[PDB]
Design a protein around this ligand. Structure first.
Ligand SMILES: Nc1ncnc2c1ncn2[C@@H]1O[C@H](COP(=O)(O)OP(=O)(O)O)[C@@H](O)[C@H]1O
Ligand SMILES: Nc1ncnc2c1ncn2[C@@H]1O[C@H](COP(=O)(O)OP(=O)(O)O)[C@@H](O)[C@H]1O
Ligand SMILES: Nc1ncnc2c1ncn2[C@@H]1O[C@H](COP(=O)(O)OP(=O)(O)O)[C@@H](O)[C@H]1O
Ligand SMILES: Nc1ncnc2c1ncn2[C@@H]1O[C@H](COP(=O)(O)OP(=O)(O)O)[C@@H](O)[C@H]1O
Ligand SMILES: Nc1ncnc2c1ncn2[C@@H]1O[C@H](COP(=O)(O)OP(=O)(O)O)[C@@H](O)[C@H]1O
Ligand SMILES: [Mg+2]
Ligand SMILES: [Mg+2]
Ligand SMILES: [Mg+2]
Ligand SMILES: [Mg+2]
Ligand SMILES: [Mg+2]
Lengths: 46, 259, 95, 257, 255, 255, 248
């Protein structure tokens, strides 16, 4: 509408973490294998 | 190199010579300006010019002239490189930028903003333009197509149209034969429109036109060159019955008072 | 509703978190903190994925109720963009 | 689908209008409805769209007059992708509604001259109103118009272009005046009274007093349906429990005491 | 250098004045003369100047948008809007010492004139909320197709805008006034058009008719008058056709 | 330190009044014709003021539009505001303790005047998301060419605010009104240009040039003198041949 | 606490203002380019139980409507809990200035704040009702201007129970000479002047032939201009600085 600039207040590049999260939800039974694989590496998750 | 004659109708008058002149001027890529009949026929002239232009020459970019009050029009004409100009913050190409090597079918809307015409003067100055917030200018090439519906010299004298706007444009003027002046293919164009309307309505047979209808059409002013006549034919077909006694009953237009 | 048995669930190791918080070694504490951050990101991602799948399924059912009830004959012609419109996610998330 | 003519005008003029609408329903062209304030024009257009061969997909009766700005109406006609920021609604949806459908507008005289020109340009080509950085889409859409103001009056005013007025006006539907219609008015009033007695779930229908009916007929009632429904509601609020035929008209909120 | 010249005594005097003013980076307001002042001449003058070695660049004054004028002076500002976050310099700052040729000067807004003349006369490159403005001495020159004193009498242009000119307003003679190389210029334009019209040469020509066509109003521009030759050549479309009994009146309807 | 082009008895009185003006940051207003250059004299006085080494603000007011004080004047150091995440400086805030000269404050928005009313009345008004502002120690200065006496009568500015904006307003006499030392200024400009144009020496002005300068209207006053100097640079001719007369007229035809 | 010229009508008005000061009722004030009751408003806040209470005085002209509700306890999407307009003024004096030229959106916000409305912003769903004593001033617009449709009628109804009338400086100027002398002494201390050389009684009477459009502001400006013109304290001044915007 009327031309202007920012006069009041109101995105993201998902990295490898959120990128693999998006790469997740591909399957469920297969997702369990990857989750077990991650839980093996992560020592603070049960 | 294709015909694409389309619905090129009403050439029995000197419009055949106008089409010959248009064909002669078609190879040139210089500025193209016309004077369409007020109310009808400018779109047909533009389509004929586009057919005259090579099909592979480029896209036929058509814009209806508008004032500069809408900043969107300014972004379309000059471009939009910086943010908050048009589209995304990136270099969203404008309408002029959208046309690269194609026809720029201008409209003689006689828009109130002379500033818009002044900006368009730079659009065709050396074949270059700069987007809104454009860090570097861009030299572009495109064909130009224009038309008219009023007396350009009258506006030039009255100051309604910029003198430089007329000077830069209008390499040659193409005049459309008026409906009150053409008057030649009225029977032929009327028959073509009637056939098309009958096909659309799935009419079993051609109803035919009485001689009184032809006399009335001759007496008719016909403000629109090829659209008002077609609209009148459609209205008559709506109020008539094909190959039946209702064929005599012809309706000029619903705007006219009912019989 | 999502199948409760099928949905995987992860729990943060409270003993490990307590050990890392009170870890005498600074390097061990930093490693524990990094692992906790990664695990929290993974858990949040899994929960969000499950919730998004549930919402997408609900939206799909909203428009496919005709096929669900009447049968395959009363299947509405639907596209990925049709489902994407009813939700805030993109067609890529739909795929 | 099938046209709905509930409480159709008993006047033969209404029947002739319906016959013309049935004749034009197989056809696909714009229509102009010369209506009045609450005359029932838009409902007639909706009934025609129902009778307009198929159901004709989406049917939208958006009015440019009842819009905050002409720019909003233009955005409804077509929204350029990425133009400005944010919106009260998905503007391209209004354009998509006409796709596989028709175009219906109310009080078209209020449309801006630039908006009218954009619409005239769109209608001849059929393409989308806003390019949005891409070639506009030519959706197969019909059209319909309904303005109380006279088209020749607008032409004299010059707000609408000659081509706009000509190509826009393909069919004319002159709504009979509500005050002029008497038998149709009585039939519609009886139908509305029956419908209200059913919907309000009143155990017994009060009916209508002869004096009350005469007073209602004496009223100008420009709103053939809108004012009729308002007066029906005014009488219903003064519920006489099927025993009071006074039918007091409290439709005017300003009127009191 | 590359641009063709009028090759007239008045044209020679104008070229000599341009050469004298070439080393000067001061502002110029050479009269646009309503289409008769070849912008290519100004470009060649900038080429002669050291601004050719610098970043010489021009722009149209009236091209800018009303709400972005401050941006137009200073480019994209980093803090102007949420999306763009970069202190992009202005077009003048994109030149920053080059030759800035101002076109559409008479069409600039009153507020635009008040901002631009004030900034140019004195002031440094200050963006939206900048820390410290940066002074960039950029060579300037302006064009005005109309009479600036007429605007001053009308008051449309500011007196500061009148003083913004630092060099003498070079004015080109009108086509009716100059009319010196009309034969040679017409021959050059005809050769260029024949090359453009894929015509090797014109077997028919008439110098008397060319002189008669020179004896015309030639309104709009001298280049506009030359375009009449191209229009006539295109209409004839033939080589063995003398220039005699040939008049280019595209606006006029033929009988 | 402070180079001065004006050496007159009235100029001497004005300079003494400047000496009579101390760094009180009072709402004094320097009034002069177009090209008066009184802003330079005000900057020289600010250098001579208590803040011998202090900040100075040019602050071309015409560049401000649809922007509050916290946009460029006060600044937006707060984050998460309208736009991206950053902290912006403020010209008025940064000028605290220095000099804040208003460039052509006559051409200002009505809302700008409304804000400046409180800004000058209190001195601690604006804040980008702040509760209590801090009073600025800057020195308020201003200079333009319009006559506020009629603008206030016309309602262009708030009479109460303008009166509060006026404390020791001083009007500089025009150079045309002065009509003295024009020959000395011309000689100084000739020397400066000969240095600039690398000329051997000033050609010299005969009695005809002196009479023309005396008879010159000089509506621009000092601006007219600068324009005449630029023309004489253009009209330098030969250093050996003294310039009998030197004239300039933007619309004067060459013949 | 507050220093001003004393007049009998002004003394009675000040006494009434002090009496109303302990009351926390909303205040709407009209000024005549003099003190403008701003000093009177501060003295009223000091005399009230809100002496230690907040005395936020917002000059409502420089804000942007896009954040107007943000100013009046509005926060949205990183840092939150920003002090609102009433929140920062809660528990004490809440003064509004520059009200003559405020936007109509500000008028609607004030109408909402008349019943104290509520501030359900993303930063906080506060019910407002801070109960702090409201006060309004800078009513440059005449009552006819309000009747001219400039402001909402409800806001005028929502205004204070009474109106603070201000008389012109021309109406009472008996102590104007004393105030001018005090201002001259203050400026001499500020200008590091040795001492006041005095004033000519004939020149003082000649200067008295003025309407004082700026009232105390005009008196102070005239005194400052005359002192600057004198530039010395050898002999008493015998001239009047009629106007800085006067040709000479
Ligand atoms: N031979 C023809 N072929 C196709 N269309 C024609 C022909 N003759 C007339 N027309 C019609 O005439 C109309 C001219 O309209 P147009 O010139 O665009 O109106 P305006 O001049 O008012 O802008 C077109 O819509 C076109 O359908
Ligand atoms: N023939 C009819 N039968 C039953 N109801 C009708 C008829 N014509 C109009 N109405 C009623 O009149 C009401 C208003 O119609 P209309 O005036 O066309 O709408 P709008 O206010 O959009 O113009 C509708 O709700 C409709 O139910
Ligand atoms: N000597 C020349 N030779 C060829 N073309 C010229 C010559 N002089 C001017 N032109 C043409 O004139 C056009 C520019 O017009 P110009 O005189 O610059 O208008 P304005 O005076 O408004 O700037 C250019 O496109 C250029 O081709
Ligand atoms: N004291 C002075 N001595 C010599 N030249 C001066 C003096 N003051 C101003 N000028 C001339 O005035 C011009 C700039 O004036 P300007 O700053 O536009 O006046 P204003 O203060 O009215 O804006 C300079 O080119 C300069 O040559
Ligand atoms: N009784 C007084 N004692 C001391 N100073 C006063 C008195 N009355 C007015 N003034 C001075 O007059 C000035 C008027 O300022 P302000 O209240 O902003 O005027 P307005 O009401 O027109 O906005 C103040 O700065 C103040 O110093
Ligand atoms: Mg309706
Ligand atoms: Mg058209
Ligand atoms: Mg030009
Ligand atoms: Mg100046
Ligand atoms: Mg005040």
């Amino acid at each position: 509408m009327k031309q202007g600039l920012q006069l009041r207040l109101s995105l993201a590049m998902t990295p490898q973490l959120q990128q693999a999260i998006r790469l997740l939800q591909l399957s469920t039974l297969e997702l369990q294998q990857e989750l077990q694989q991650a839980l093996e590496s992560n020592p603070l998750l049960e | 190199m294709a015909e694409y004659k389309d619905n090129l109708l009403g050439e029995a008058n000197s419009f055949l010579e106008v089409l010959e002149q248009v064909s002669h001027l078609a190879p040139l890529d210089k500025p193209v300006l016309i004077i369409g009949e007020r109310g009808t026929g400018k779109e047909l002239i533009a389509s004929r010019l586009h057919y005259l232009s090579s099909r592979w020459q480029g896209p036929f970019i058509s814009l209806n002239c508008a004032a500069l009050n809408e900043n969107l029009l300014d972004s379309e004409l000059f471009g939009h490189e910086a943010g908050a100009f048009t589209g995304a913050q990136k270099r969203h190409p404008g309408r002029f930028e959208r046309a690269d090597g194609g026809t720029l079918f201008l409209d003689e809307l006689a828009t109130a903003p002379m500033m818009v015409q002044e900006k368009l003067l730079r659009v065709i100055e050396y074949g270059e333009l700069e987007r809104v917030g454009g860090s570097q200018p861009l030299q572009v090439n495109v064909r130009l197509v224009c038309a008219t519906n009023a007396d350009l010299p009258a506006m030039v004298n009255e100051g309604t149209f910029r003198a430089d706007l007329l000077d830069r444009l209008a390499f040659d003027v193409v005049q459309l034969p008026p409906l009150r002046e053409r008057e030649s293919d009225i029977m032929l164009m009327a028959e073509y429109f009637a056939i098309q309307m009958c096909r659309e309505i799935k009419l079993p047979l051609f109803p035919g036109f009485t001689e009184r209808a032809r006399e009335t059409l001759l007496n008719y002013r016909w403000p629109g060159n090829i659209r008002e006549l077609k609209n009148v034919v459609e209205r008559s077909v709506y109020r008539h019955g094909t190959s039946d006694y209702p064929l005599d009953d012809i309706i000029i237009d619903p705007f006219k008072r009912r019989p | 509703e999502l199948n409760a048995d099928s949905i995987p669930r992860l729990k943060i190791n409270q003993q490990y978190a307590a050990m890392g918080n009170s870890a005498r070694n600074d390097a061990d504490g930093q490693f524990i903190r990094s692992n906790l951050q990664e695990a929290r990101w993974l858990i949040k991602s899994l929960e969000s994925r499950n919730d998004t799948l549930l919402r997408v399924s609900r939206c799909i059912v909203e428009q496919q109720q005709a096929f669900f009830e009447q049968g395959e004959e009363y299947m509405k012609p639907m596209v990925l963009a049709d489902i994407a419109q009813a939700v805030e996610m993109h067609e890529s998330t739909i795929s």
